[PDB]
């Protein structure tokens, strides 16, 4: 069998040396991932997607995504362990975790644990392939201190769960293969077969790129089944069929059941209507409960008395008979008009009647539509809401919000009383306004400002320590968002809620529909992200991706590989192809340069990793969808194992005993324990490790985002197609 004599050898070193080196490289990996894990205190890159999906799992709100559910459910499960409710939505990059406390440190720590645990799995994979402890240490170090693997595995991303599942798959398959070489159908053989299947299931249940890991293990499993089919293997056809049926069960059938199990959990957790509904059929949507918000949601009509609540501060739009001071503390002149403030408690001064524009044919009981002109009458003071070209108390650029008498507001000031419930999305213009479910900006028509409030500073004693309400000129700002909370004057007929009768759908029908939608949307979504990259640029790490930027501090996170480490792997792949071509040419000439044991290393573990790298790299040249550098991290992970292994072989006594005799011929004498030139090999590995570590330290400001770089220091890190922020 492939590399049978090599893989059945005892370990080349005592276990204490392996335990020493695995501990050191795991501690380095831990230090690199947990360094400043609380920073930045803001949403970074795709945390906007995976944090948001974690929130929807906790709320039980149905969402659609192009990837399978397992890794998102693992993130959500950490939130659930922290008692997080899903309130924070991760809507944009740069959103502060201080205003709405998501357990972001716990999520980042979970990924940092998985990224750290990848390193000892990689180490133990080479240990089980009978490589030296220093070789295992070096290959694992190339992942422990790679800038791309570090950046991805400390943020709230799926790739930490993907990469550990790929590492576990490679390790479990190597363990299975050693059990297969020693004694097939042992209890240990079954454990490792099903552990390979389980790990393969987690790979494909995280991202569909996991098919490349199935292809790599599938190829190796087929090659070994081909050797067991040979008459020279001494197996009966019944014994071969026993191998085939058990591997089919352990590597295909059981992993497929575990893959379906994650969709069954996903549909059982997500039992409420949500943002995913638009991607599914009406029959699927009938399986979802109404949202708690939709149950209480009532259409807002003209002449309804409403309370309007701010989304970020929970404050109600409020007014009372007190007036703005004739001058603010900075000496600016106010209108001396009636105060409009943000009040956090429900009272009679939160009540606004929604009135149509003057001269409209719109009667009582007609629904208010989004982006229609309206007037708001304060019920307690009998005044119209007004905004004008007077500056607000705290913000000189924002407008003071006040109220005017009915006579003046029906006279010359009529334009200044016109508001609209402006939708957050232009697609939602002309939809019916509903309480609790429809967010809007309260937009002033004449001056083109949105009503806004804040809770970092409260009005002085003359404003009763209430929140300021002002006209923000940055209309698109997400902090300008309001909702109608209650309709106070709701008719008894409009109070009656009719619950939707949930209709059951068979699980396989539900799964087939979602799966078709997943593949159809993954194939579409054509776009031009200022960071898409083609497969030919990945092994060189020629371009990267901006993950986060802070303009005030001139700080940034940039996703890029350790270029010294990546180029060392490209050289390693090229050298190996050269060695294989040279071995094939020399053998075809009757010249047997390489010892049998060197060939078992080359055509066994090194060829297994080389083909596994090919499976994770070349299929991307056949993909016409958008691609990104992170898609190469599975291939880079395998290239780290490969490069460590290759250089041990190069620094071994590779010579055949007799250059005219093929040592592969049965009964030929060959050297069973080729000497590794440990001294020059260790010096070589230390030199490469020091260069990779130097690069990691030099790029560490861009991995962590924690240090501001001068423009000259930014430009010194710009090479090839690396564009960095703050180079000017």
């Amino acid at each position: 069998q492939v590399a049978e004599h090599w893989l059945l050898q005892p370990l080349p070193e005592p276990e204490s040396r392996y335990s020493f080196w695995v501990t050191i490289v795991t501690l380095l990996a831990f230090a690199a991932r947990f360094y400043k894990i609380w920073y930045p205190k803001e949403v970074v890159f795709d945390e906007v997607h995976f944090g948001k999906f974690a929130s929807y799992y906790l709320e039980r709100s149905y969402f659609f995504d192009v990837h399978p559910p397992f890794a998102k459910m693992m993130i959500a499960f950490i939130g659930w362990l922290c008692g997080y409710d899903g309130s924070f939505k991760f809507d944009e990059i740069g959103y502060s975790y201080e205003t709405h406390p998501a357990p972001y440190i716990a999520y980042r720590s979970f990924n940092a644990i998985l990224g750290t645990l990848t390193v000892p799995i990689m180490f133990n994979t080479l240990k089980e392939l009978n490589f030296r402890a220093i070789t295992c240490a070096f290959a694992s170090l190339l992942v422990a201190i790679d800038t791309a693997h570090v950046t991805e595995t400390r943020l709230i991303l799926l790739d930490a769960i993907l990469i550990i599942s790929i590492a576990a798959t490679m390790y479990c398959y190597v363990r299975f293969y050693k059990c297969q070489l020693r004694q097939p159908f042992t209890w240990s053989w079954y454990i490792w077969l099903h552990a390979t299947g389980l790990s393969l299931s987690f790979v494909i249940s995280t991202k569909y790129v996991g098919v490349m890991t199935y292809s790599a293990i599938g190829f190796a499993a087929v090659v070994n089944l081909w050797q067991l089919l040979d008459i020279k293997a001494g197996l009966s056809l019944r014994q071969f069929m026993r191998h085939f049926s058990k591997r089919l069960n352990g590597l295909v059938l059981i992993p497929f059941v575990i893959y379906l199990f994650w969709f069954w959990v996903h549909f059982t957790v997500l039992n409420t209507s949500g943002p995913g509904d638009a991607f599914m059929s009406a029959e699927f949507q009938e399986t979802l409960k109404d949202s708690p918000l939709s149950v209480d949601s009532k259409t807002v009509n003209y002449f309804d008395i409403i309370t309007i609540k701010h989304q970020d501060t929970d404050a109600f739009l409020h007014s009372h008979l007190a007036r703005y001071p004739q001058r603010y503390e900075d000496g600016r002149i106010s209108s001396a008009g009636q105060q409009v403030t943000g009040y956090t408690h429900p009272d009679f001064n939160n009540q606004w009647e929604v009135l149509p524009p003057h001269g409209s044919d719109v009667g009582k009981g007609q629904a208010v539509l989004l982006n229609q002109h309206i007037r708001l009458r304060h019920v307690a003071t009998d005044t119209y809401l007004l905004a004008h070209d007077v500056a607000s108390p705290f913000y000189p650029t924002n407008e003071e919000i006040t109220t005017v008498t009915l006579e003046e507001g029906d006279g010359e000031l009529y334009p200044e009383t016109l508001f609209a419930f402006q939708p957050l999305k232009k697609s939602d213009e002309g939809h019916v306004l509903k309480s609790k479910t429809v967010s809007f900006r309260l937009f002033h028509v004449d001056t083109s400002v949105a009503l806004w409030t804040h809770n970092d500073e409260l009005l002085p004693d003359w404003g009763f320590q209430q929140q300021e309400i002002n006209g923000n000129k940055k209309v698109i700002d997400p902090s300008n968002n309001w909702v109608v909370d209650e309709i106070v004057n709701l008719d008894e007929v409009r109070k009656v809620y009719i619950p939707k009768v949930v209709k059951p759908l068979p699980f396989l029908k539900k799964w087939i529909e979602t799966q078709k939608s997943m593949f159809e949307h993954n194939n579409k979504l054509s776009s031009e992200h200022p960071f898409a990259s083609e497969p030919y640029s990945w092994p060189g790490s020629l371009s990267g991706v901006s993950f986060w930027t802070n303009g005030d501090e001139k700080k940034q996170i940039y996703f890029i590989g350790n270029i010294i480490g990546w180029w060392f792997q490209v050289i390693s792949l090229a050298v190996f192809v050269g060695i294989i071509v040279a071995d094939l040419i020399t053998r075809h000439r009757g010249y047997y340069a390489l010892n049998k044991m060197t060939r078992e290393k080359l055509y066994g573990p090194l060829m297994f990793f080389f083909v596994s790298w090919c499976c994770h790299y070349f299929p991307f040249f056949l993909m016409a969808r958008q691609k990104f550098l992170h898609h190469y991290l599975p291939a880079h992970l395998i290239a780290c194992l490969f490069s460590g292994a290759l250089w041990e072989v190069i620094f071994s006594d590779c010579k055949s005993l007799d250059l005219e005799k093929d040592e592969d011929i049965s009964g030929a004498s060959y050297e069973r324990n080729p000497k590794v030139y440990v001294k020059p090999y260790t010096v070589f590995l230390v030199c490469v490790s020091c260069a990779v570590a130097w690069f990691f330290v030099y790029f560490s400001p861009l991995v962590y985002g924690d240090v501001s770089l001068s423009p000259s220091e930014v430009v010194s890190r710009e090479w090839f197609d690396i564009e960095l922020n703050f180079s000017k």
Binding site: H49, F64, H521, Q626, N725
Partner: peptide
Amino acid sequence: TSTNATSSSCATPSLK
């Protein structure tokens, strides 16, 4: 408004 250096730190799309 100073023009941006790298287009902008943005996310990957998830369809409609």
